[PDB]
Amino acid sequence: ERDCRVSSFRVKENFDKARFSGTWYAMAKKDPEGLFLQDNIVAEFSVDETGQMSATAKGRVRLLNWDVCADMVGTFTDTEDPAKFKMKYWGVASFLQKGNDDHWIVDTDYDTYAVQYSCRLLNLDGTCADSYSFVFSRDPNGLPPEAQKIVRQRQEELCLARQYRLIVHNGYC
Numbered sequence: 001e002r003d004c005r006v007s008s009f010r011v012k013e014n015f016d017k018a019r020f021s022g023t024w025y026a027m028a029k030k031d032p033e034g035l036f037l038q039d040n041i042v043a044e045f046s047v048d049e050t051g052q053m054s055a056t057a058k059g060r061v062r063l064l065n066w067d068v069c070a071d072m073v074g075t076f077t078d079t080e081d082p083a084k085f086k087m088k089y090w091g092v093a094s095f096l097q098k099g100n101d102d103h104w105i106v107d108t109d110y111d112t113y114a115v116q117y118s119c120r121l122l123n124l125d126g127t128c129a130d131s132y133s134f135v136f137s138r139d140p141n142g143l144p145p146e147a148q149k150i151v152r153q154r155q156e157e158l159c160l161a162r163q164y165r166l167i168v169h170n171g172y173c
């Protein structure tokens with residue numbers, strides 16, 4: 001039986017903030033409870049001179065049967081693992097969803113694909129009770145087959161492979 005304990009999940013060895021910087025298009029998402037980012041999700045990652053990673057995102061978001069284009073902001077606090085962060089986030093608009101989630105770079109090759117994961121709440125057996133995950137691509141037209149195959153493996157390793165939906169980019173925002 002597969003190990004689905006969050007503590008067991010491998011993440012990106014020697015994660016490199018600088019190489020990860022720039023534009024990432026969300027191709028797929030596994031939603032948490034009370035999902036927020038809906039579609040047209042585009043992220044912009046940056047790293048400052050002190051070495052701190054941060055990001056912005058734009059996308060159609062769920063407010064209520066009410067969705068809207070929103071700009072989000074995230075700042076990442078380092079942990080002992082170079083691929084595991086604490087992400088403080090908020091909307092440019094006061095009323096938008098704000099919070100602090102774990103933010104793991106599960107895998108990336110920096111120039112093609114990235115797999116992100118967050119467990120918001122653990123089960124008592126160490127599995128995740130409430131998770132989300134994004135698959136990003138540098139190219140909004142999607143991953144090449146080699147990357148697609150690696151990503152599928154990573155999705156399976158997170159015990160999430162059956163639970164993603166595709167994210168469309170159709171110029172809405």
Ligand SMILES: CCCCCCCC/C=C/CCCCCCCC(=O)O
Nearest residue numbers: 035036037043055057072073074089
């Ligand atoms: C995984 C975060 C999304 C992409 C990284 C960019 C981070 C910078 C923008 C702030 C993120 C705010 C959105 C956090 C809610 C995610 C959960 C959800 O969409 O349902």
Ligand SMILES: [Cl-]
Nearest residue numbers: 021045046047
């Ligand atoms: Cl940068």
Ligand SMILES: [Cl-]
Nearest residue numbers: 052076077078
């Ligand atoms: Cl930090």
Ligand SMILES: [Cl-]
Nearest residue numbers: 005007125126
């Ligand atoms: Cl555990």
Ligand SMILES: [Cl-]
Nearest residue numbers: 149150152153
């Ligand atoms: Cl595969």
Ligand SMILES: [Cl-]
Nearest residue numbers: 145148149152
């Ligand atoms: Cl395949």
